[PDB]
């Protein structure tokens, strides 16, 4: 049995394993253990012999605002800074990214709003992507925080968006807006709904999916994915291992945490 999370739930409907991020008031920001819980949920979908599709849905106006940096500038159990950051960043990132890389069921993502950070990195590893309207974007803010690529974006961002686009958006910290997503065929359908109701959007996506899978041999879908994955599996594994160990030096240096401290240090001069 898998434990319970007040921020991520799931269910099984026919051949669909549906994952739901249900913390809309913090913009679905996830901590380390929430990323490890996603990894576990994907490992749980991967072993059900009745599941063929794995569907990741969200709630609110954001898909996910990224990692949870709440309480990171607080000053207040590790013998060094390297050991601390190994345990608190490298393990989580390597684990959840590899869980997404090797998934054997078809991964579908329903974008109800923007995605940021490691969550956008995980969006760009899903196989099919649906958007609610044309106000969605992906933001990888690594140069502003003092970090480098995460979640296999080294391989997936140039693969799905282009090399020149990726350079212009990552070197200068810009978003992958919706028209860039539509020029590269990133989004498979735009449901064009009001951005206020993500529940109706999620329900509509599931209904349309149920219509599409009528009459197909589904083992065939799983075999075709097994073969289509073998194109870039080695690139992704190599990038995973290299990224999580190259970003450790940026954490240990001390720039990300310094920038975090001077982010939340804007007290005003006079009062009221």
């Amino acid at each position: 049995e898998i434990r319970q999370n007040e921020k991520i739930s799931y269910r099984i409907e026919g051949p669909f394993f549906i994952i739901h991020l249900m913390n809309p008031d913090n913009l679905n920001a996830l901590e380390g253990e929430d990323y490890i819980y996603l990894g576990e949920l994907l490992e749980l979908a991967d072993r059900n012999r009745d599941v063929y599709f794995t569907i990741i849905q969200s709630s609110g106006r954001f898909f996910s605002s990224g990692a949870d940096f709440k309480g990171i500038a607080k000053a207040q159990k590790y013998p060094s800074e390297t050991s601390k950051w190994v345990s608190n960043f490298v393990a989580r990132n390597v684990y959840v990214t590899d869980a997404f890389i090797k998934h054997s069921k078809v991964l579908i993502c329903c974008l109800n709003g923007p995605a940021i950070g490691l969550s956008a990195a995980l969006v760009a590893l899903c196989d099919i992507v649906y958007s609610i309207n044309d106000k969605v974007y992906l933001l990888y803010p690594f140069a502003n925080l003092g970090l480098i690529t995460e979640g296999g974006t080294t391989v997936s961002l140039p693969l799905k968006f282009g090399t020149n686009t990726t350079y212009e958006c990552l070197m200068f910290n810009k978003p992958f807006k919706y028209d860039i997503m539509c020029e590269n065929g990133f989004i498979s359908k735009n449901f064009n709904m009001p951005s206020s109701n993500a529940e109706a959007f999620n329900a509509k996506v599931l209904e349309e999916l149920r219509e599409k899978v009528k009459g197909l041999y589904l083992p065939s879908c799983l075999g075709m994915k097994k073969l289509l994955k073998s194109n870039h599996i080695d690139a992704f594994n190599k990038a995973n291992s290299v990224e999580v160990n190259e970003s450790l030096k940026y954490w240990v240096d001390g720039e990300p945490l310094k920038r975090f401290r001077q982010l939340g240090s804007k007290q005003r001069k006079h009062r009221l």
Partner: protein, 313 residues
């Protein structure tokens, strides 16, 4: 004309600002003679009303909220006194507790949005003002909000509050206040000044509005009018430490240094009344005129009348 909150990136930072520090728990006091006075809440209320010291009212509410941690009004009044006592973290903590018990309190939402603005968490203040609106005028706000890449959060909520202000047949204040706060965070202080001066003509017997006028002015480099509004606020309430601190800051800004050291001694003496917060500003005002005799005597365990002379009251 709005895309989302966080405005197509470029507001991701400034959304992390309101989160990285976390939440601090309320830091109680060790010598609180009201630890078991079953009238401690009553005593706190009567201290708040009778113009007594604010530190003592704060202690009484400490007791009342350590006797029954569900008395929402006790948390509310503790936050109210702690923010006018110039303790923003204790005030924010108390008001957060109150709002978490009573998620539809109005004055808690308002005072907490003002404190957030003071600390620089502008987006949390925006959400709190949105929530105050939709819990105060739910139907009007609900049909305002359903009308649905150029506009950011501040402008969006300013337009919403403007339209809310027009869709009612009065000019009832506490809506002009929030308009002033939105403009204030935008850094166009003259709209804020107009709003606060208008909210005072409808009730010029306020102290918080005079202090907010003082702050809005002093941000715009009108230090003389700032001094005058602080003096007004203090005339209406001599226990108001927020106003003394602001007064001293702007005095230091305009070369008045003996008065400012007197004001900081007075603030450190209004905090230290049980039988404290930033001292660095006192060090700065002493380094301005450079008197080593008092410069080198910095201590959170010292005397204040020991600072006789020019520093003396």
């Amino acid at each position: 004309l709005v895309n989302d909150d966080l405005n197509l990136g470029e507001d991701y930072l400034k959304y992390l600002g309101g989160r990285v520090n976390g939440n601090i728990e309320y830091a109680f006091q060790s010598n609180n003679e009201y630890f078991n006075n079953p009238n401690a809440y009553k005593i706190g209320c009567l201290l708040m009303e009778n113009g007594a010291k604010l530190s003592e009212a704060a202690l009484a509410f400490e007791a009342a909220v350590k006797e029954k941690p569900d008395h929402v009004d006790a948390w509310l009044r503790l936050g109210l006194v702690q923010t006018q006592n110039e303790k923003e973290l204790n005030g924010i903590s108390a008001l957060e507790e109150c709002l978490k018990l009573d998620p539809k309190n109005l004055e808690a939402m308002k005072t907490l949005a003002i404190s957030y603005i003071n600390e620089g968490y502008d987006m949390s203040a925006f959400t709190m003002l949105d929530k105050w609106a939709e819990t105060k005028y739910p139907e009007i706000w609900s049909r305002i909000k359903q009308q649905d890449t150029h506009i950011d959060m501040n402008a969006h909520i300013t337009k919403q509050f403007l339209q809310l202000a027009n869709n009612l047949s009065t000019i009832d204040p506490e809506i002009q206040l929030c308009l002033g706060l939105l403009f204030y965070t935008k850094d166009d202080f003259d709209k804020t000044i107009d709003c606060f001066e208008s909210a005072l003509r409808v009730n010029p017997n306020d102290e918080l509005m005079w202090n907010r006028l003082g702050a809005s002015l002093a941000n715009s480099n009108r230090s003389e009018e700032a001094i005058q509004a602080y003096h007004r606020a203090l005339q209406l309430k001599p226990s108001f430490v927020r106003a003394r601190y602001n007064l001293a800051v702007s005095s230091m800004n305009i070369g008045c240094f003996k008065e400012a050291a007197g004001y900081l001694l007075s603030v450190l003496s209004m905090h230290e009344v049980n039988t404290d917060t930033v001292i660095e500003t006192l060090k700065r005002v002493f380094i301005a005129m450079n008197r080593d005799d008092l410069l080198q005597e910095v201590k959170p365990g010292m005397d204040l009348k020991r600072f006789k002379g020019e520093f003396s009251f």
